[PDB]
Nucleic acid binder design. Structure first.
Ligand SMILES: [Mg+2]
Lengths: 469, 414
RNA sequence: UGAGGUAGUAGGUUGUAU
DNA sequence: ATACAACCTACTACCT
């Protein structure tokens, strides 16, 4: 006998100032906010990879359908959506020979092979960036499936064919940060899933019914990396800054340390959205402790406030901090020693470790998305993942898990916090889907941290997201 | 001044909706049979009246489905007659959108006409349409995407919204209805190393500084601790549990949080002992323990006609639940569902990878109703009376076998 | 590593008080 | 260094 409140689905804004609930429908209807003239693409890989990428680029121009056009909207083609040309005629190839991959891939040490392959790719990319006249917006790296299989941290090479992190993606994106090259990594089995079949004569990955969804996600990621704005939030307040704090364990360092990384979300004076990472991962040397020291917390808050002031010109009225952990007294005391008296500091803990599953008794479908169970004035549950009436299906697979949102520190209306989190679940530029589960601040801070802790050290890293996602 | 779009109704709907909404957003009056959610009595007569009296252009969606469709052909003939009447050569503008239809297999009605190619690119085709409309002086208004958004909301989304309706959900929380009157700290001093095993005793007991936090009587431990036969009841600290749950205890003897944690530990230990007493099989996870049943222990594995044990491909799958106890926000027992696999009826698989793969394979086709029914069936199986089930704590703890129901004021229409 | 979701497996920390 | 609860990350495998 308890009451669940409902939070209306937030609306995102598109071209012509038109609001919509679905990113795909809004893009196919009105278009992106930006005006890109075209995407000039550089391709790195074998000749087979270049052929696969050319075939996919020619395929993506034509409309692509899903099995059901209500559950999954169909792709009407790249130029029919984004109003810009992304063709195979603007491709700037850079060949990586198969013997080059064979020389480095087959090694007893996984670290050495990962370093060698990453160096082989990035050296060509950097040389083409510096010593060529052609302009490249995004560099597409068509990695063969063997590299992906054998370059994971826990991968073991069978004896039949026999610092930095032993991961191809993280090391590749971390060693390319000093040059600010937005790059997109594809696997050959992704763009040509038909040709990679198992012993049963069927493709290992089946994209027959979700081809349009794959095209949507790939096109949105490529458009965002080239410098486009697909959509933005529409129903958020003014004078409020959203933060995020994610801790990642650093393994390259001899002493285990915890690096805290942030993502900052707010609005500018031109009604646009400013969403970029707050970086320089602040280090806690004590293993197993996920709380910042007072000086690190002071530096973090000072940097965030300085960025906000330099962007707008006035200190934020409110600052919301989202984290998967719980702030202690020292962290918050350090935080209050820097923020001005006019600024309100709220520290919210968002977790997904509370197993409260709600089962609907009148069908085979799950609980509606957006339903919230307010435990008290400082604790509530939110169903960010669940049945969505628009797509006539649920974002989960069996039964969704709830997001336990608790206002750890400060004073705020928990209804407003739930509204903010549900709105932030609509800003994932890495994919073209409906709203996701995690807030975008936490997810993108995690994405940044996964890369900034995959190298020994790095100078002041870029704030832009196209260099990480 | 209208623009008529003729198409196969259920087959060419995606392109027709796209083009109609794009043209509406650009300032054109578009007449399409999908832009009307409610259809009137007079359809064909109204269609002919629209073609003869209203439209200034006739866009035909030329595809494989629309090649020899009776309605499309009838509209084509009426449009040809209208074009002859108005002495306009370019009244009918076909749109080639299907790659399966060759340019030599188009019907007689449009075999002589200059078409617009949408096969390679929809954007190029739309640009061609707009250029032709501008060149031929087709009437239009000022561009306004708000009209397109409004039409999309009205027609293509009216049956896909949230309706206000009472809904009842069943959770996985079993509220603890009755609690023991009080908690006892038994200061037994040494008591022969105070039963060093601790966790192996019949009754749930934990070791404090020099005390023993229990809910049962002191003599109950005489079976495992003979010395406690001479233990005196005078060394007992009584503490009121109902007052503890309200956060009333203070002072330096013990903290309220410590009391709540100790109560949680006692409840979890008691639950483990009761489940061990219920003759059920146990599986050790990475951080918890789950309880499952065997092949033929139920007749016939259809408790309340819900099924608990089944046959996937070559192994027998058994339902399971794992439990804990929490005081946040109110005293509840919190259980979670799991699926385990055995090679035979009474066996187990030591390979964790195959267990994970089989669990993921089976989770794909179960859904909320089967999940809830199996959870409720297991809970009812563990029940001991009409509307509860008890666990040993003389003293005992009763937990309801009916999960707490939540109520919402919004829902959907399946 | 197109992207989410759901699970499983390891490890560590914290006020305790043996 | 044991037991416990209460919070934390890293790393896979599978479905769509
Ligand atoms: Mg990406």
């Amino acid at each position: 006998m308890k009451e669940l409140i409902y939070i209306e689905e937030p609306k995102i804004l598109f071209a012509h100032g038109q609001k919509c609930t679905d990113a795909r429908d809004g893009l196919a209807l009105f278009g992106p906010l930006n005006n890109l003239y075209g995407i000039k693409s550089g391709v790195i890989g074998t000749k087979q990879g270049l052929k696969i990428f050319r075939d996919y680029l020619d395929h993506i121009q034509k409309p692509i359908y899903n099995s059901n056009s209500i559950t999954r909207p169909m792709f009407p083609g790249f130029e029919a959506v984004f109003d810009c040309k992304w063709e195979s005629t603007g491709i700037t190839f850079k060949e990586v020979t198969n013997e080059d991959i064979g020389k480095f891939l087959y090694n007893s040490s996984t670290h050495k092979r990962t370093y060698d392959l990453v160096s082989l790719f990035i050296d060509k990319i950097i040389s083409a960036n510096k010593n060529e006249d052609e302009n490249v917006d995004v560099w597409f790296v068509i990695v063969p499936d063997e590299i992906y299989k054998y370059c994971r941290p826990n991968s073991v090479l069978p004896k039949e064919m026999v610092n930095y992190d032993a991961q191809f993606h993280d090391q590749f994106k971390a060693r390319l940060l000093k040059h600010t090259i937005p790059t997109q990594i594809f696997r050959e089995s992704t763009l040509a899933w038909r040709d990679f079949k198992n012993a049963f004569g069927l493709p290992i990955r089946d994209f027959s019914k979700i081809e349009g969804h794959l095209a949507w996600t790939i096109s949105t990621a490529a458009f965002y990396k080239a410098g486009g704005k697909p959509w933005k939030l529409s129903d958020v307040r003014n004078g409020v800054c959203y933060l995020g704090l994610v801790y990642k364990k650093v393994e390259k360092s001899k002493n285990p340390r915890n690096a805290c990384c942030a993502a900052q979300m707010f609005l500018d004076n031109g009604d646009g959205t400013v969403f970029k990472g707050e970086v320089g991962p602040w280090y806690n040397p004590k293993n197993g402790q996920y709380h910042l020291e007072p000086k690190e917390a002071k530096a973090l808050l000072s940097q965030s406030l300085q960025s906000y002031k330099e962007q707008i010109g006035e200190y934020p009225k409110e600052v919301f901090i989202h984290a998967k952990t719980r702030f202690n007294h020292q962290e918050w005391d350090a935080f209050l020693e820097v923020t001005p008296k006019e600024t309100n500091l709220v520290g919210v803990t968002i977790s997904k470790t509370k197993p409260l599953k709600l089962y609907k008794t009148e069908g085979d479908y799950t609980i509606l998305r957006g339903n919230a169970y307010v435990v008290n004035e400082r604790s509530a549950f939110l169903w960010t993942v669940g049945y969505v009436p628009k797509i006539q299906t649920a974002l989960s697979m069996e039964v969704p898990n709830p997001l336990f949102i608790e206002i750890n520190k400060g004073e705020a209306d928990i209804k407003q916090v739930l509204k903010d989190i549900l709105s932030l679940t609509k800003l994932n530029y890495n994919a073209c889907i409906f709203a996701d589960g995690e807030p975008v601040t936490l997810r993108f801070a995690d994405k940044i941290g996964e890369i900034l802790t995959a190298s020994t050290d790095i100078k002041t890293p870029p704030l832009a997201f196209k260099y990480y996602i | 001044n209208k623009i008529f779009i003729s198409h196969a109704t259920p087959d060419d709907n995606d392109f027709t909706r796209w083009l109609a909404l794009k043209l509406i957003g650009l300032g054109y009056e578009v007449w399409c049979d999908i832009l009307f959610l409610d259809k009137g009595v007079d359809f064909w007569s109204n269609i002919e009246k629209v073609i003869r009296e209203d439209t200034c252009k006739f866009l035909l969606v030329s595809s494989s489905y629309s090649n020899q469709r009776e309605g499309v052909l009838k509209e084509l003939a009426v449009a040809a007659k209208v074009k002859k009447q108005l002495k306009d050569d370019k009244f009918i503008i076909p749109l080639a959108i299907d790659e399966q239809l060759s340019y030599d297999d188009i019907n007689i009605d449009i075999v002589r006409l200059n078409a617009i190619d949408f096969k390679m690119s929809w954007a190029r085709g739309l640009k061609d349409i707009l250029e032709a409309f501008e060149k031929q002086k087709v009437p239009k208004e000022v561009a306004d995407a708000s009209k397109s958004n409004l039409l999309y909301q009205q027609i293509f989304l009216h049956d896909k919204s949230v309706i206000e309706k009472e809904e009842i959900y069943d959770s996985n929380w079993l509220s603890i209805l009755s609690f023991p009157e009080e908690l006892r700290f038994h200061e037994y001093n040494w008591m022969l190393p105070k039963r060093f095993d601790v966790r192996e005793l019949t009754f749930p007991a934990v070791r404090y500084k020099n005390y023993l936090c229990t809910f049962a009587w002191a003599y109950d431990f005489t079976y495992h601790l003979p010395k406690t036969e001479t233990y005196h009841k005078s060394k007992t600290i009584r503490i009121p549990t109902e007052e503890i749950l309200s956060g009333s205890y203070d002072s330096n003897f013990i903290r309220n949080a410590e009391c709540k944690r100790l109560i949680v530990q006692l409840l979890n230990k008691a639950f483990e002992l009761r489940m061990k007493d219920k003759e059920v099989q146990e599986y050790e996870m990475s951080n918890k323990t789950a309880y499952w049943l065997e092949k033929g222990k139920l007749e016939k594995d259809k408790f309340e006609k819900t099924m608990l044990v089944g046959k996937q491909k070559d192994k027998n799958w058994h339902f399971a639940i794992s439990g804990a106890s929490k005081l946040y926000p109110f005293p509840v027992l919190m259980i979670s569902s799991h699926i385990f696999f055995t090679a035979d009826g009474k066996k187990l698989i030591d390979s964790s990878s195959v267990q994970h793969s089989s669990r993921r394979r089976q989770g794909k086709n179960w859904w909320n109703n089967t999940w809830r029914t199996k959870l409720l069936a297991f809970i009812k199986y563990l029940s001991d009376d009409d509307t509860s089930f008890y666990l040993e704590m003389e003293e005992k703890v009763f937990v309801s076998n009916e999960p707490v129901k939540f109520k919402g004021n919004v829902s959907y229409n399946i």
